[PDB]
Each structure stands twice: as structure tokens, then as C-alpha cells.
């Protein structure tokens, strides 16, 4: 039983994996899930976020207190989690990234592939060598992405992409659920929205990752494609898969289809845990 390292996405924290981790633990699998820099217990909030009712002008303009967080910072934290998971002595690890977390795990795996048995992209950025995540967000394959209407700051002004999980506007809160959690129970959504933060560093999205076939490319590679994802659309998920397949011909991606929104860790954590166990048992 390899140990899983679970890496969350933008505005989220390790808490989003709570149900999945419990299901894995019951199935006999250990997991390490930690907050990325600038997220969770590491979050910082603009003063404008705590002055209510929200002044959209001020909240749009305020320089982010997490603007200087980098993709390298993300990679460093993930690599530390891989180290600890490896040191627990069950061999090489299964490294899982969701959404923006795919950028962090990609960077980590190229820098230090040795301790990683399998790398898993759950509805995540799995970018081509040298291509920043932002290029994908604006790609034709992602036309329709439902995050655009939730944006409350210009990244050129704020140094972050900003949302308001504490909005008192019914339309905004409905859109947040439709975009990230359409298949979730309303109460589950509200509990997640309570834990979300408002600022995600902009710079990591504009940072190319210099992957190579011999390092990142050599790792047994899985993509869990979420067929009703409204933010990283299925066509964009498939572009990532097709690019990796062309890049490393002798090590094609192992694809796992899930009929889910972007957030199966809330809507079907038991099923997601089952896919992860399948991956852990898979033969490379």
C-alpha cells in the first residue's frame, strides 16, 4: 500500500480531501494532505475582505498579501510532503493534484521524480513543457469556463485572482456552486464555501514548467477526467492528455472517466477513493 500525497487547488485547502482520505484510510491506505503556501492555515486576507457589506471597488484594487507566492513555493511544499510520505517506508508515493494543484505536482515531479511511483491529475492542469497554465485557461478548449463571472479583481492590479466565498449575494453564491460543485448537496457546498479563502496568487499561473520526458515523463501517469467539469472543461482535460501522449510516446496517460463536476471529493468521495485505489494497484 503506497502512501498518497493529496494536493488541492485554488482557494481550497487540505480539508477538501477529508472524505476521500477517510475512505482511503478505511481501505488500508495512508494519505498526507497539506495546505499549499497562501492557502488554508497559510492564507492571508486583504483588509477589504473583512469590511462588510463588500466594497467591490476596494476589494478589486487592494494589492494581495499573497501576491509574492510562487510556483517554486508550491513545489517546495509538495516535495516536503512527498519526502515525509516516502520516509513512512511504504516505498514510492502516489502524488495526486486537483485543479491548480496539477501545476504544483508537475513542478515537484520534474524537480524530484525519484520518490514518486505514480502521478495523478484530477481535473487538473497537466501542462505541456514550457506552457504556462494561463495559456490553457484562455485556450479555445476552455471557452465557456464558468469562473470568469466570479472574478472580483483584475490580476494586473491585485497580483491575485479573487473570489468572494462570503458573498451575501444569492446570484453569486448560486454561480459558485454551479461552477465548482453542481452535483453537491447544498449543505456540503456551504460547508466548503466557509473554509475557502479569497486570494489565489496570480504568478504561479503565468509560470512555465520545464518538464522532460526522462524525468516527469517517465512517471506512471493517470488523469481522472471529470465529464461535467465547468471550470477546466472536458475538452481542455483531453488536450492535456493528448499533449502528454505525443510528448512521451512510450508512456501514454492512463485515463479514468468520472461522471462528475470539478469537485468529486464532495459529490462522490467514496467513488473517487475507489479510483485512487485502482490507480495504486495498477501495473506500470
Residues in contact with its own copies by CB under 8 A are 13-15, 18-19, 22, 25-26, 28, 30, 32, 34-35, 40-45, 50-53, 80, 84-85, 87-88, 166, 168, 187-188, 190-192, 194-195, 197
Q: Which residues neighbour 109 within 8 Å (Cβ) at sequence distance 6 or greater?
A: 95, 116, 119, 215, 216, 219
Comparison of 26 and 242: residue with beta carbon closer to its own copies: 26
Comparison of 60 and 165: residue with beta carbon closer to its own copies: 165
DSSP tag of 17: G
Comparison of 90 and 111: residue with beta carbon closer to its own copies: 90
Least gap, CB of 101 to its own copies (angstroms): 16
The distance of Cα 21 from the centroid of its chain, to the nearest Å, equals: 16
Least gap, CB of 266 to its own copies (angstroms): 8
Selecting among 64, 99, 260, 261, the annotated active-site residue is 99
Q: Exposed, middle or buried, 218 (CB in 10 Å: 0-12/13-18/19+)?
A: middle
Told to judge if 129 belongs to the known catalytic residues of this protein, a careful annotator would answer no
How is residue 255 written as a grid cell? 485515463
Nearest to 266 by CA among 185, 211, 154: 185
- 30: number of Cβ within 10 Å: 15
Q: Which residues neighbour 14 within 8 Å (Cβ) at sequence distance 6 or greater?
A: 6, 8, 33, 34, 35, 40
Cis peptide before 53 (omega within 30 of 0): yes
Least gap, CB of 25 to its own copies (angstroms): 4
Least gap, CB of 50 to its own copies (angstroms): 6
Comparison of 19 and 239: residue with beta carbon closer to its own copies: 19
Least gap, CB of 192 to its own copies (angstroms): 7
Comparison of 193 and 244: residue with beta carbon closer to its own copies: 193
How is residue 44 written as a grid cell? 492571508
Q: Pinpoint the alpha helices (H) of the chain.
A: 18-26, 56-61, 71-85, 101-111, 133-137, 155-158, 170-180, 186-195, 234-247, 264-267, 269-281
> Which active-site residues does the annotation give?
99
Amino acid at each position: 500500500h503506497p502512501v498518497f500525497v493529496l494536493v488541492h487547488g485554488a482557494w481550497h485547502g487540505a480539508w477538501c480531501y477529508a472524505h476521500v482520505a477517510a475512505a482511503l484510510a478505511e481501505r488500508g491506505y495512508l494519505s498526507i494532505a497539506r495546505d499549499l503556501p497562501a492557502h488554508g492555515i497559510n492564507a492571508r486576507f486583504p483588509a477589504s475582505y473583512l469590511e462588510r457589506p463588500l466594497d467591490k471597488d476596494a476589494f478589486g484594487a487592494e494589492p494581495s498579501p499573497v501576491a509574492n507566492t510562487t510556483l517554486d513555493d508550491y513545489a517546495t511544499q509538495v516535495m516536503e510532503a512527498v519526502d515525509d510520505a516516502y520516509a513512512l517506508g511504504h516505498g514510492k508515493v502516489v502524488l495526486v493534484g486537483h485543479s491548480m494543484g496539477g501545476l504544483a505536482i508537475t513542478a515537484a515531479a520534474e524537480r524530484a521524480p525519484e520518490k514518486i511511483a505514480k502521478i495523478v491529475y484530477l481535473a487538473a492542469f497537466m501542462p505541456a513543457s514550457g506552457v504556462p497554465g494561463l495559456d490553457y485557461v484562455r485556450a479555445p478548449e476552455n471557452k465557456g469556463e464558468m469562473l470568469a463571472p466570479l472574478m472580483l479583481a483584475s490580476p494586473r492590479v491585485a497580483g491575485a485572482l479573487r473570489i468572494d466565498p462570503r458573498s451575501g449575494d444569492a446570484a453569486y453564491r448560486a454561480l459558485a456552486k454551479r461552477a465548482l460543485y453542481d452535483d453537491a448537496a447544498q449543505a456540503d457546498f456551504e460547508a466548503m464555501a466557509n473554509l475557502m479563502t479569497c486570494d489565489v496568487p496570480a504568478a504561479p499561473f503565468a509560470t512555465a514548467i520545464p518538464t522532460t520526458a526522462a524525468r516527469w515523463g517517465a512517471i506512471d501517469r493517470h488523469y481522472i477526467k471529470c465529464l461535467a467539469d465547468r471550470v477546466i472543461l472536458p475538452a481542455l482535460q483531453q488536450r492535456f492528455i493528448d499533449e502528454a501522449d505525443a510528448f512521451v510516446p512510450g508512456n501514454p496517460t492512463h485515463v479514468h472517466q468520472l461522471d462528475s463536476s470539478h469537485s468529486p471529493f464532495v459529490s462522490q468521495p467514496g467513488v473517487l477513493a475507489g479510483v485512487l485505489v485502482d490507480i495504486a494497484k495498477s501495473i506500470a
